[PDB]
Design a protein around this ligand. Structure first.
Ligand SMILES: *[C@@H]1O[C@H](CO)[C@@H](O[C@@H]2O[C@H](CO)[C@@H](O)[C@H](O)[C@H]2NC(C)=O)[C@H](O)[C@H]1NC(C)=O
Ligand SMILES: *[C@@H]1O[C@H](CO)[C@@H](O[C@H]2O[C@H](CO)[C@@H](O)[C@H](O)[C@H]2NC(C)=O)[C@H](O)[C@H]1NC(C)=O
Ligand SMILES: O=S(=O)([O-])O[C@@H]([C@H](O)[C@H](O)[C@@H](O)CO)[C@H](O)C[S@+]1C[C@@H](O)[C@H](O)[C@H]1CO
Ligand SMILES: *[C@@H]1O[C@H](CO)[C@@H](O)[C@H](O)[C@H]1NC(C)=O
Length: 863
């Protein structure tokens, strides 16, 4: 064995020859740091027994265990391999215990496959007999994509493992973690996955969510593939420089999907086609959100709101954290400190703003006939709590209010309970959206108020390297019991089940509306239901840098509406950091400035009504709002086709290997390049300029750089923003709310390519109705520019905005002077627009034009 290819046989303890011999592995204490001294042999594992059997969907094989002594339990004797050729670009295989049913994720979106093997496969599947291995290769070039032959298949009740070689080291994904870099180096690295309330810091631990998806860019041609494991048990993913990746899990079954694409974007699209495409956000959820833990009183909250309104900050949503509650209890508000709450909400609404309230899962069990607590009384009547292992007594833990029980959101009768709680509360405080937190689930005691019994669930043969080394640390007992099964098996599905139930509640509370759900904990497929934030970060320059890979990864995971707490949750934010963070933060898909308890104010206006930070924050938030029709159309493509929103350079520029590890810059869709200053004291950033025409957003000027590293001059008041030649960006005059800004004149920014051509599109609907796309109530138009000509073209036309909207300005970058501008409407001429032209910058701006939204036009000019 070449040392890069050794598969570690002692993941659980420091390596010894005696343990190696006892396990029947190979011993070689010679090797570079991290190279396993003890590793699985060439042979041993499982072998194929007899022949493969053709089925309608693909094939089955029986695998029989090559005997050895138990490591972490003894391998299941007979394993069944079921292989389904589901589509041309998606292969599914699962490994089950041939004799017993095992836990399988009861995913809400994924359906069982029936039907026949797809035609025109882009992949071929190869099975080796002795020992068992599975290989998936790309048909067109025979590139080996998945190849398990590097390691054994291990399949014991509480220890399952399968490895695969990888065709390159361009590997992106896995979660939820702070990876720090976007491209995984492929040096010996183990990532534990198990939903846990812990700080997203530099220690590389398991965080709030469970995401097994990874994408691999195979080569410069763009050809890419992805892998997904459908398994909700505690697990870790081991990366090594072969290159190779091992999945090591402690229950369930190995249920794998392999996705192929011509480009990275097509791999994400194939993945989201399987697990579920993201929900379309309400248009208002794309504006700026402001928040903090512990305003303390409504007076203090109103004070913050009003100083940011007075500053003309674009500011659509105010969040209210646990301080609104009466003693941190769900579905109450503090009648003294938040006296006047309903009247404040009216004020918010009348100002065009929205209210999002935090709701925790854990319910106070403190209720007597003297002093009733309704959510607990109604919950106990319905019998909808998570129970201890006896299957009958509700588990007691502790969160914000004191001792608590936990809803079992897997029980469909729990959504009924939860919905009524929301109905009852909305009658008091008319919130518009819901922020669901602490849903790993997070417990202030370990397991329960009486701890956890010693047994194989709470104390398993092998524990992945999760924070603190016990599964029940700061969560529920592993033998706690829910409708979908035991906590051991479904722990990673709590936040997922809770987002599903919460989306159910929205159907009653916000009939026909999307509303907004923000969730902490996630499983694969959570973006169908919710936005995500990156959790309790810290006001450091490290946390600023680390945010970008975290945002890009959740876009691969199909949770495109994602961002961190701008300026940092924990700690007092320095002015310089917060100013650089607000500049970048104006371009996160989810843009929220949120702050921890006790720390100095960090809302933009708090820095002073004439401060650089406020001026800069207002400036870039106004740019964000200007480009909201472009951002919104990007979320439309994510929702309907599965595209990313916040996009890596390498997804558009994969032919250039200089982009393969860029994580300090990113794109909005194909066309907008964002380059933040991310270092203290810097007024410059070393940045990559991909192989395209680029125009400075602010001046419109063509940059002299192409396909090269540059130092971009970015003073205290700037972030780099460039528009790609070849693309047309729809815009709308901004205002301090989207309620108002949506009524304003539209514009087009045409960035010309070398041939003086460009293309773009605009999606437009009512901005809030649920499933306008599935029910086809929307406008979609295309803009295309050739020499001397712009065409506005309508493809779907089943929504006409009642506000009489129109394009009143067109800015053309990289153009020679356009003259004699003519506008035709469905063929008919007329009259004559104004053109202003800057021959130095090659910018033309056409005004005094009125192109109605949803109407076809041709706009023509001479040179
Ligand atoms: C948790 O325990 C409760 C009892 O405390 C179980 O409630 C049962 O619910 C069904 C209706 O769905 C009733 O017909 C039973 O009579 C209830 N039992 C009792 C003793 O009242 C609940 O099923 C348990 N949940 C889980 C996941 O085990
Ligand atoms: C941007 O938003 C505000 C709403 O907050 C609009 O404010 C004014 O609009 C009208 C003036 O033409 C008045 O009828 C409203 O009373 C007034 N609202 C306020 C602040 O009192 C403003 O018009 C919007 N901008 C644009 C271009 O429409
Ligand atoms: O006391 S804290 O440090 O703030 O508790 C955090 C962890 O529980 C804790 O750090 C844990 O990891 C240590 O064991 C918790 O996540 C805060 S929540 C999430 C945030 O967005 C809201 O504003 C907060 C109030 O609702
Ligand atoms: C690792 O964890 C501890 C917090 O318990 C902390 O002291 C340290 O900052 C963390 N390491 C890094 C480098 O983030």
């Amino acid at each position: 064995v070449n040392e890069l290819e050794r598969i570690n046989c002692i993941p659980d303890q420091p390596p010894t020859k005696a343990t190696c011999d006892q396990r029947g592995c190979c011993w070689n204490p010679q090797g570079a740091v991290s190279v396993p001294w003890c590793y699985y042999s060439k042979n041993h594992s499982y072998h194929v027994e007899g022949n493969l059997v053709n089925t309608n969907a693909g094939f089955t094989a029986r695998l029989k265990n090559l005997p050895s002594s138990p490591v972490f339990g003894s391998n299941v004797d007979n394993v069944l391999l079921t292989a389904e050729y589901q589509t041309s670009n998606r292969f599914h295989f699962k490994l089950t215990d041939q004799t017993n049913n095992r836990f399988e994720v009861p995913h809400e979106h994924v359906q069982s496959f029936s039907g026949n093997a797809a035609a025109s496969l882009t992949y071929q599947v190869e099975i080796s007999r002795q020992p068992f291995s599975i290989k998936v290769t790309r048909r067109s070039n025979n590139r080996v994509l998945f190849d398990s032959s590097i390691g054994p298949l291990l399949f014991a009740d509480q220890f399952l493992q399968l490895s695969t070689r990888l065709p390159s080291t361009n590997v992106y994904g896995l979660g939820e973690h702070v990876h720090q870099q976007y491209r995984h180096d492929m040096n010996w690295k183990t990532w534990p996955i198990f939903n846990r309330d812990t700080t997203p810091n530099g220690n590389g631990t398991n965080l709030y969510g469970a995401q097994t998806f990874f994408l691999c860019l195979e080569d410069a041609s763009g050809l890419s593939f992805g892998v997904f494991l459908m398994n909700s048990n505690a697990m870790e993913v081991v990366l090594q420089p072969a290159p190779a990746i091992t999945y090591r899990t402690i229950g369930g079954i190995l249920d794998f999907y392999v996705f192929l694409g011509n480009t990275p974007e097509q791999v994400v699209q194939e993945y989201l086609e399987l697990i579920g495409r993201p929900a379309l956000p309400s248009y208002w959820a794309l504006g700026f959100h402001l928040s903090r833990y512990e305003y303390g009183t409504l007076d203090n909250m109103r004070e913050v709101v009003e100083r940011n309104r007075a500053a003309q900050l674009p500011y659509d949503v105010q969040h209210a954290d646990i301080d609104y509650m009466d003693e941190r209890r769900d579905f109450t508000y503090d009648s003294v400190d938040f006296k006047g709450f309903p009247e404040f909400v009216n004020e918010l609404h009348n100002n065009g703003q929205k209210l999002v309230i935090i709701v925790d899962p854990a319910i106070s069990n403190n209720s007597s006939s003297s002093k009733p607590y309704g959510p607990y009384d109604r919950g106990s009547d319905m019998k909808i709590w998570v129970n201890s292992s006896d299957g009958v007594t509700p588990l007691i833990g502790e969160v914000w209010p004191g001792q608590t029980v936990f809803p079992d959101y897997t029980n469909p009768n729990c959504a009924v309970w939860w919905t009524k709680e929301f109905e009852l509360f909305h009658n008091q405080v008319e919130f518009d959206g819901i922020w669901i937190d602490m849903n790993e689930v997070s417990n202030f005691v370990d397991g329960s108020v009486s701890g956890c019994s010693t047994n194989n669930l709470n104390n398993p043969p092998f524990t992945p390297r999760i924070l603190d080394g016990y599964l029940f640390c700061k969560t529920l007992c592993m033998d706690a019991v829910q409708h979908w099964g035991k906590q051991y098996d479904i722990h990673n599905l709590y936040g997922y089940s809770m987002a599903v139930a919460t989306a159910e509640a929205a159907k009653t509370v916000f009939p026909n509306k999307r509303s907004f759900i923000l969730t902490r904990s996630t499983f694969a497929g959570s973006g169908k239901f919710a936005a995500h934030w990156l959790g309790d970060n810290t006001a450091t320059w490290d946390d600023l840098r680390w945010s970008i890979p975290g945002v890009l990864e959740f876009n691969l995971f199909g949770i495109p509406m994602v961002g961190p707490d701008i300026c940092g949750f924990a700690l007092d934010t320095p002015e310089e950091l917060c100013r650089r963070w607000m500049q970048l933060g104006a371009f996160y898909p989810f843009s929220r400035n949120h702050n921890g308890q006790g720390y100095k104010d960090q809302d933009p206006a708090s820095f002073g009504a004439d401060s650089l930070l406020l001026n800069s924050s207002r400036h870039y938030l106004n740019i964000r709002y200007t480009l909201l029709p472009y951002l919104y159309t990007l979320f439309f493509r994510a929702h309907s086709r599965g595209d990313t929103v916040a996009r890596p350079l390498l997804h558009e520029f994969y032919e250039d290997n200089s982009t393969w590890d860029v994580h300090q810059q990113f794109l909005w869709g194909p066309g907008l390049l964002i380059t933040p200053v991310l270092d203290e004291g810097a007024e410059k950033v070393m940045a990559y300029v991909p192989d395209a025409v680029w125009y400075d957003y602010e001046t419109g000027s063509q940059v002299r750089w192409r396909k090269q590293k540059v130092e971009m001059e970015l003073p205290g008041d700037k972030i780099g923003l460039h528009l790609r030649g070849g693309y047309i960006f729809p815009t709308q005059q901004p205002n301090t709310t989207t309620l108002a800004s949506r009524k304003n004149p539209l514009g087009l920014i045409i960035a010309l390519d070398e041939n003086k051509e460009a293309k773009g599109e605009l999606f437009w609907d009512d901005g809030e109705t649920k499933d306008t796309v599935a029910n086809k109530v929307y406008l979609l138009c295309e803009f295309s520019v050739t020499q001397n000509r712009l065409e506005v073209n309508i493809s779907q036309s089943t929504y006409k905005d009642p506000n009489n909207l129109a394009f009143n300005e067109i800015k053309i970058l990289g153009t020679e002077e356009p003259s004699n501008v003519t506008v035709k409407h469905n063929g008919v001429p007329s009259t004559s627009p104004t053109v202003t032209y800057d021959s130095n910058l090659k910018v033309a701006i056409i005004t005094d034009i009125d192109l109605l939204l949803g109407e076809a036009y041709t706009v023509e000019w001479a040179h």
